[PDB]
Design a protein around this ligand. Structure first.
Ligand SMILES: NC(=O)C1=CN([C@@H]2O[C@H](COP(=O)(O)OP(=O)(O)OC[C@H]3O[C@@H](n4cnc5c(N)ncnc54)[C@H](OP(=O)(O)O)[C@@H]3O)[C@@H](O)[C@H]2O)C=CC1
Ligand SMILES: [Zn+2]
Lengths: 114, 134, 86, 125, 207, 95, 341, 146
């Protein structure tokens, strides 16, 4: 059970990297909306950042956390340097997705998928 | 009429004459608006207000385990005991045997080919029946 | 609100079900003979904790663990189910 | 310097798979049955992992078979059952393992075809 | 010299075998296996900790001089505990010879970046990270290289579906290209091609 | 022979024809239904049956290497004709 | 259900929704959103069109292969209407102009053509019929456009009793003639308004809200024989609305009153263009008509649609009207217009 | 060869009786509500269910659990089995306790009131295998079938 670390030697070290990334993402949203001329609000973008961080709050492997932070940092670099286009930034909001009901009955009516 | 799924169209549990539990696998999906059979009844229960407590295939199989635990031991033949007791109880009520000779429903091959809704609807079985009779 | 069904799960070979196995060998036929109309479903399965299921009206169910119970305690547990009815 | 990590391997958050095709899928781990049309056994050596079959419908333009299942054609090969199960756990797939079926050994005797007093005596060759 | 059979060259097989055990003698700390194939290709299989020492020795040692990194790639083998095989193909102009160096890693374990040994490795390692997800430590500028911006997953993994998970189109309402779950008008047809009869006895695996 | 359904739509040699009430025939409105009117089932039935002298005859479809794989047809059954499984030509043993 | 119209798939481009729709007037502003929403889910859409084929090209990428079918038709040629509707399960009528041409007047587009479609659709056995009218349709209206809407709305009702009739307020969107209309008045200096825009109230509704409402009516079994009023969530004074339009566009706003009579004279002068008029007398009347309040009719909420505020989507439409200096101003930089509670 | 019957006479849509008492297609929502209404007006012995020969166990328990919620126990099957004495209380009472493979281990088989050749063709094949290789003895009470 002794494995080579990526960056953080334990969860406490990893969590500090998470918060450093979150601050960078939090600070960058106003520029992203300004630079990409997005119609969303700065609040909507910051809520989306929170939502992306919240979906990974159950991880307890410092290595898995380090990879998530690594991918988050790369994700931020593309946005800041405007390598992403508006289409790439707005893919987080799934604006053209018709909502898929999550209850048994609604699924039962529409098809066989569970 | 509530259209359901055939055995080729669902992952269903069947127990053979040994008491061995086995499960099918979905090979194709049901046609038209037809649905998985246990899902129709679960959907009905919710509409009726008496919602059943399982929403997935695994959960309803956990329910099978509570009623008869061997229904989820797939490909395993679980032995059954207590023939002595089943025989003691069978002698309590005496009953007469009929004078009818024991005659199975299927005497010859023509009686074999159609015995359920699926084989009755089958044109290949109908060809087989026509062949053996003629 | 009365009792409708009784299920007894036990293992064929486990030592935790020996009392339950004893009860069926000895007191089942007279208990069934006492309640000719009540379904008592004995279902054996390998390596399952012995358990008693009682089903009352409108689908309500309760279960009692019989792991390590003696032949006496099984008679008691059923006598509870057949007597007081939830 | 190695660290002590004390949790089960879970890579679901760094695989890029959508949530739908982790939690809702059912993986089958099995050794394929021998195709009965042929006697060769060389396709029953390795373990396979497949996913549950989902809807296919007819394309309105041409009648081709359309699908919305990204995993419809995904089949993975493994040396052993444990390797397949290890792969399914770290990816977070519910799975079913079917035990390998090896043909039972048989007792064959050509001379039994000509038995003096047993029913194995053949009426033709 | 049968016309249809590839001729066998034994002088090279001996020469590569000799150099193979020469490498193993000098670097026992890292070398786990050495083998030579029937078409005369020498492969060194090493512990991942020895990526830099082994490659540096092969580049600089006077009897090696593998100055050119031909190719650096990875192979995904899901059945293995370490699924990712990392493959370095090196060329020696001085001795007109080629060598392959192989190591391994898994999803969560990094590999030392060989950029300090070969600057050619910079983009090869970006490709391996992009297509397989193998992270390289101390890489000067690691990030996707082949996939689309924001693409999730590592397509060359065996468990990544051929058609992926999403697809693009232009939506007039939002006046931009959007990404949506992939649906195909015609599903890719899986073919079961393997013959049920063994082809190559010489490679039979014991039961 | 190419047939027209009561809706007027031509019937293909595979028997396909949109039934009345199938929306999918709107695709032909203002255009046409591509139908090949040389039905191969009909054309092959117009060929004469070839009388031969031997019990076995071979067919390669004509043209040597430009036909089909060469096969051999038994002609022992005198109630029916031997048909080539590739090209459909029929053969008969003369007396 | 015929087996070929039973839904399949997960609701995407290659799925089968089961809807076969003929959309008349699909080449206009509202049509492009309706066709887009039908194609998204895999519907068969028949687009009978009068314009040059080049002007339908933007519709082609909206459906999988074969799902968008184009036909020619003439509003006066009832043979060309049967061809387009006789394989359909729903017919959607979106025909309309904001001006009268030498060949078609308001009666033609809002009475005779809607009636012909409904009468032919009824004979073809079309199950469902969706007709777009107008919130302010009224027989006694000063606008002849709105007088014809009232006559047409009634005619479609007798002809096709089970028709869903939708009555939207003014619609705002990228290609609207509403927010774009006000933003374009800058080319003339000040913004003329009758009674300084202090006498008119508007309740504009977002294009996507209308489109979702139309699509939900097709699928909702209870939308038959009903009449809906699609209105936005907030009512505004015209002056507040137009002032907000100029704030979001960052253009100098110079309102000045113009009496009703003198501002029909300008409307009559713009009608002389043989092209698309910049404004008309009828356009003047409609813009200054107070939006009706019709509580007795079900709204967007009864079709599962939650109305979109003008503040979320104004920048989406009005950004292109800014100069370079202001192109990058965020949505928050302009405070919302005052609403009528 | 009976699989081709899966392509014929298939139920593909919910159906309800119309005012003329004829079956007509409808939606799941409508058909389920119509059944849900009647199920709420009845209890106990008024509600019963019959399970046919091709029903899966997942459906069997779901239907039992549903009818148990109206306090109905009349969950019946078409095939009969005597309920006297143990009835179905004991699994050994209604099983093939020797197992199919166990036929190869038997020296005498007594068949009663059955035609295994058509009732269970592969179980009859196992009997002939024992008849041939183990010299098994077979006796039959019933119609003298081949
Ligand atoms: N603010 C709004 O947008 C509101 C709209 N409505 C109603 O909604 C419907 C559509 O609105 P909108 O899409 O903005 O209108 P558009 O003018 O944007 O498009 C109208 C459609 O009608 C067609 N059309 C017009 N006149 C004729 C004709 N004489 N013969 C054949 N086709 C014709 C046009 O086809 P072509 O392009 O070939 O000319 C076009 O496709 C109309 O009925 C309109 O009155 C209701 C309330 C408010
Ligand atoms: Zn031929």
């Amino acid at each position: 059970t002794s494995v080579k670390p990526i960056f953080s030697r334990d969860m406490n070290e990893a969590k500090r990297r998470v918060r450093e990334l979150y601050r960078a993402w939090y600070r960058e949203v106003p520029n992203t909306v300004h630079l990409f001329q997005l119609d969303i609000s700065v609040k909507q973008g910051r809520d989306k950042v929170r939502e992306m961080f919240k979906k990974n709050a159950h991880i307890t492997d410092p290595r898995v956390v380090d990879l998530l932070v690594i991918k988050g940092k790369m994700e931020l670099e593309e946005t800041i340097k405007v390598w992403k286009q508006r289409t790439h930034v707005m893919r987080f909001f799934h604006e053209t997705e018709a909502p898929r009901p999550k209850d048994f009955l609604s699924k039962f009516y529409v098809g066989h998928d569970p | 009429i509530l259209p359901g799924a055939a055995y080729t169209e669902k992952s269903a549990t069947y127990v053979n004459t040994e008491g061995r539990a086995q499960q099918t696998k979905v090979a194709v999906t049901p046609p038209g608006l037809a649905r998985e059979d246990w899902k129709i009844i679960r959907a009905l229960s919710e509409i009726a207000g008496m919602t059943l407590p399982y929403d997935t295939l695994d959960q309803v199989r956990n329910r099978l385990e509570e009623v008869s635990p061997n229904l989820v031991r797939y490909d395993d033949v679980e032995g059954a005991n207590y023939f002595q007791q089943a025989s003691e109880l069978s002698k309590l009520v005496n009953q007469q045997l009929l004078a009818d000779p024991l005659v199975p429903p299927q005497l010859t091959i023509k009686d074999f080919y159609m015995t359920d809704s699926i084989s009755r609807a089958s044109q290949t079985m109908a060809k087989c029946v026509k062949a053996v009779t003629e | 609100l009365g009792l409708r069904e009784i299920r007894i799960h036990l293992c064929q070979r486990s030592p935790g079900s020996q009392g339950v196995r004893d009860f069926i060998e000895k007191r089942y036929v007279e208990l069934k003979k006492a309640n000719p109309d009540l379904p008592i479903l004995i279902r054996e399965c390998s390596d399952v904790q012995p358990k008693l299921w009682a089903r009352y009206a409108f689908g309500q169910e309760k279960n009692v663990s019989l792991n390590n119970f003696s032949a006496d305690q099984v008679t008691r547990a059923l006598e509870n189910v057949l007597s007081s009815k939830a | 310097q190695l660290i002590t990590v004390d949790e089960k391997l879970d890579i679901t958050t760094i695989t890029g798979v959508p949530e739908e095709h982790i939690k809702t899928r059912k993986a089958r781990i099995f050794v394929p049955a021998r195709n009965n049309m042929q006697s060769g056994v060389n396709n029953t050596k390795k373990w396979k992992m497949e996913f549950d079959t989902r809807e296919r419908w007819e394309n309105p333009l041409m009648g081709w078979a359309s699908t919305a299942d990204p995993l419809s054609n995904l089949v993975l090969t493994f040396s052993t059952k444990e390797d397949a199960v290890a792969f399914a756990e770290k990816n977070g797939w519910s799975y079913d393992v079917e035990e390998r079926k090896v043909p039972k050994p048989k007792s064959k005797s050509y001379g039994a075809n000509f038995s003096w007093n047993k029913r194995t005596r053949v009426s033709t060759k | 010299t049968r016309p249809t059979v590839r001729p066998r060259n034994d002088v090279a097989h001996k020469q590569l075998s000799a150099f193979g055990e020469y490498v193993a003698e000098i670097l026992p700390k890292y070398v786990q296996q050495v083998q030579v194939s029937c078409f005369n290709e020498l492969e060194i299989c090493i512990h991942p900790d020895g990526v830099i020492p082994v490659l540096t020795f092969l580049r600089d040692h006077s009897n090696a001089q593998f100055k050119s990194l031909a190719d650096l790639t990875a192979v995904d083998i899901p059945t293995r505990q370490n699924r990712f095989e990392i493959v370095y193909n090196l060329l020696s102009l001085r001795f007109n010879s080629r060598i392959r160096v192989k190591t391994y890693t898994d999803e969560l374990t990094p590999i030392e970046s060989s950029v300090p040994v070969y600057k050619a490795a910079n983009w090869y390692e970006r490709e391996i990270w992009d297509m397989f997800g193998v992270f390289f430590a101390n890489h000067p500028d690691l990030r996707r290289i082949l996939t689309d911006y924001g693409f999730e997953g590592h397509p060359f993994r065996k468990d990544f579906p051929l058609s992926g998970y999403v697809e693009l189109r232009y939506d007039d309402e939002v006046k931009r290209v959007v990404a949506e779950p992939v649906e195909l008008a015609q599903e890719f047809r899986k073919f079961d091609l393997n013959s049920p009869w063994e082809a190559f006895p010489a490679y039979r695996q014991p039961p | 022979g190419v047939r027209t359904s009561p809706t007027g739509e031509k019937v293909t040699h595979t028997g396909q024809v949109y039934d009345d009430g199938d929306y999918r025939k709107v695709r032909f409105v203002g255009r046409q239904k591509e139908v090949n009117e040389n039905f191969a089932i009909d054309l092959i039935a117009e060929q004469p049956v070839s009388q031969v002298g031997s019990r076995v005859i071979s067919c390669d479809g004509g043209g040597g290497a430009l036909g089909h794989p060469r096969v051999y047809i038994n002609l022992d059954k005198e109630t029916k004709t031997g048909t080539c499984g590739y090209c459909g030509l029929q053969f008969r043993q003369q007396h | 259900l015929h087996h070929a119209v039973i839904p399949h798939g997960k609701g995407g481009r290659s799925s089968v929704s089961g809807i076969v729709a003929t959309v008349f007037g699909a080449t206009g502003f509202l049509g492009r959103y309706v066709v887009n929403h039908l194609g998204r889910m895999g519907s068969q859409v028949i687009v009978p069109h009068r314009c040059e084929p080049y002007d339908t090209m933007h519709l082609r990428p909206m459906g999988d292969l074969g799902q968008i079918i184009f036909m020619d038709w003439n509003g006066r040629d009832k043979d060309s209407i049967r061809r387009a509707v006789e394989h359909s399960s729903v017919v959607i009528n979106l025909v309309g102009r904001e001006w009268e041409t030498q060949n078609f007047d308001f009666e033609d587009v809002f009475v005779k053509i809607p009636q012909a479609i409904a009468q032919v659709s009824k004979e073809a056995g079309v199950e469902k019929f969706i007709h777009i009218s107008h919130l302010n349709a009224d027989i006694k209206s000063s606008s002849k456009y709105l007088r014809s809407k009232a006559v047409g709305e009634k005619e479609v009702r007798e002809t096709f009793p089970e028709a869903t009739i939708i009555k939207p307020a003014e619609i705002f969107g990228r290609e609207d003639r509403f927010l774009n209309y006000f933003a374009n008045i800058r080319w003339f200096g000040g913004v003329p308004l009758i009674s300084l825009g202090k006498k008119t109230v508007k309740q504009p509704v977002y294009i996507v809200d209308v489109t979702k409402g139309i699509i939900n009516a097709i699928k909702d079994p209870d939308a038959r024989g009903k009449t809906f009023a699609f209105v936005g969530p907030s009512r505004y004074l015209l002056f507040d609305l137009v002032q907000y339009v100029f704030a979001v566009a960052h253009r100098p706003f110079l309102p000045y009153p113009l009496p009703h009579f003198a501002y029909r004279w300008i409307g009559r002068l713009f009608e002389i263009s043989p092209f698309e008029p910049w404004t008309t007398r009828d356009k003047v009347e409609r813009i200054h008509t107070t939006d009706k309040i019709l509580p007795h009719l079900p709204g967007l909420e009864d079709l599962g649609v939650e109305a979109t505020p003008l503040e979320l989507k104004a920048i989406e439409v009005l950004r292109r009207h800014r100069t370079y200096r202001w192109l990058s101003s965020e949505i928050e930089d302009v405070q919302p217009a005052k609403t009528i509670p | 060869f009976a699989y081709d019957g899966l392509k014929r006479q298939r139920l593909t849509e919910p159906m309800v009786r119309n005012e003329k008492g004829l079956l007509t297609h409808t939606t799941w929502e409508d058909a389920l509500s119509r059944v849900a209404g009647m199920l709420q007006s009845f209890q106990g012995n008024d509600v019963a269910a019959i399970a046919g020969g091709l029903v899966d166990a997942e459906a069997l328990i779901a239907l039992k659990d549903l009818l148990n919620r109206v306090d109905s126990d009349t969950l019946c099957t078409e095939e009969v089995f005597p309920t006297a004495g143990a009835g179905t209380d004991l699994r050994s009472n209604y099983l093939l306790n020797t197992t199919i493979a166990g036929v190869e281990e038997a020296d005498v088989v007594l068949l009663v009131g059955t035609n295994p050749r058509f009732e269970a063709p592969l179980f009859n094949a196992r009997i002939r295998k024992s008849w041939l290789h183990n010299d098994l003895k077979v006796a039959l009470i019933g119609s003298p079938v081949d």
